[PDB]
Amino acid sequence: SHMQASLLKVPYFVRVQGLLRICALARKIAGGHYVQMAIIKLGALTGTYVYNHLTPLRDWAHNGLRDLAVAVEPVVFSRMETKLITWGADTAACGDIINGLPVSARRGQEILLGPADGMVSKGWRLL
Amino acid sequence: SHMQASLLKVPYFVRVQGLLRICALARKIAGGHYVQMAIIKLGALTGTYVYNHLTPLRDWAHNGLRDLAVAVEPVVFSRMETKLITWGADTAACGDIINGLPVSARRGQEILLGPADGMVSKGWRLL
Ligand SMILES: CCCCCCCCO[C@@H]1O[C@H](CO)[C@@H](O)[C@H](O)[C@H]1O
Ligand SMILES: CCCCCCCCO[C@@H]1O[C@H](CO)[C@@H](O)[C@H](O)[C@H]1O
Ligand SMILES: CCCCCCCCO[C@@H]1O[C@H](CO)[C@@H](O)[C@H](O)[C@H]1O
Ligand SMILES: CCCCCCCCO[C@@H]1O[C@H](CO)[C@@H](O)[C@H](O)[C@H]1O
């Protein structure tokens, strides 16, 4: 799904499993909390976030990890802004760009990202 | 604003007008189609795309611009993959990352991006 922005063509659920399995290894070592933070941040780069209500830190986290985190929904180690959006097939418009692609047309509750050229003849309407 | 992914805090319609004002300067000069393509590509990396149906090429484009374009809805000069999406408040889920921020919660028709910590208190629900 284009809405997940993952560098890896792998299901989100499975990506979190793999990431936490690497973390589990450091759960009991000395600077283990530092290690996990590193791996979690590396996961973020790949476009994979972990949430406490889905994969409780209590089941894999080193005791010091939670102190390094400034948030666990999802787990992040530096300030990250919080925004509100209402975007939907009903409000989408030209000018909008989603994960790198420009909004170009609509057809029902579907929105076309990228070039729309030659799509009008098929029921798509330009936004 | 977040759904427009523009490096400039300027209305979308104003950004395009500024871009096409520069393009017009080259509408009639020799090799102007090349100059306009550079300008339009600069707009792209800045977050602004132009569409033929919003601002027709016949009003500002140099005669050779169309030939260089691979599409005009919006104007691009190389392959751009076209995607079809179905997404909204009713479908948003964790694992989703929108223009850099992770989906974390839902309240009504609004969706929360970024940390949700402490929001469950305000009537928001983790996804
Ligand atoms: C950070 C990106 C990692 C990408 C590789 C993910 C590999 C996920 O591997 C997963 O491991 C689980 C057990 O840990 C198994 O139960 C799953 O079946 C398996 O697919
Ligand atoms: C790629 C980004 C370009 C930014 C330059 C924007 C220049 C604004 O352009 C001007 O804006 C005014 C109102 O805002 C209009 O009334 C003018 O007609 C228009 O030319
Ligand atoms: C950085 C990319 C710029 C691309 C635009 C190139 C425009 C070439 O501009 C050239 O200027 C010459 C005057 O010296 C004219 O004689 C040529 O006919 C004209 O094509
Ligand atoms: C001042 C001279 C400016 C030349 C304009 C260069 C615009 C670069 O346009 C290119 O567009 C591609 C997608 O279309 C991107 O993937 C490249 O990273 C980007 O460099």
UniProtKB/Swiss-Prot annotation, chains A, B:
PTM remark: Palmitoylation is required for NS2/3 autoprocessing and E2 recruitment to membranes.
Cofactors (names): Zn(2+)
Region feature Interaction with host SCPS1, mapped onto this chain: 30-50
Superkingdom of origin: Viruses
Signal peptide limits: none
Domain (Peptidase C18) ranges: 1-127
Membrane topology type: Multi-pass membrane protein
S-palmitoyl cysteine lipid attachment residues: 23
Active site: 53, 73, 94
Localization: Host endoplasmic reticulum membrane; Host lipid droplet
Outcome following mutation: residue 53 to A: Complete loss of NS2-NS3 cleavage
Note on cofactor: Activity of protease NS2 is dependent on zinc ions and completely inhibited by EDTA. This is probably due to the fact that NS2 protease activity needs NS3 N-terminus that binds a zinc atom (active region NS2-3).
The protein's assembly and partners: Homodimer. Interacts with host SPCS1; this interaction is essential for viral particle assembly. Interacts with envelope glycoprotein E1. Interacts with envelope glycoprotein E2. Interacts with viroporin p7. Interacts with serine protease/helicase NS3. Part of the replication complex composed of NS2, NS3, NS4A, NS4B, NS5A and the RNA-directed RNA polymerase embedded in an ER-derived membranous web. Part of the viral assembly initiation complex composed of NS2, E1, E2, NS3, NS4A, NS5A and the mature core protein.
Entry domain remark: The N-terminus of NS3 is required for the catalytic activity of protease NS2. The minimal catalytic region includes the C-terminus of NS2 and the N-terminus NS3 protease domain (active region NS2-3).
Function field: Cysteine protease required for the proteolytic auto-cleavage between the non-structural proteins NS2 and NS3. The N-terminus of NS3 is required for the function of NS2 protease (active region NS2-3). Promotes the initiation of viral particle assembly by mediating the interaction between structural and non-structural proteins.
Name used for this protein in its record: Protease NS2
Gene source species: Hepatitis C virus genotype 1a (isolate H77) (HCV)
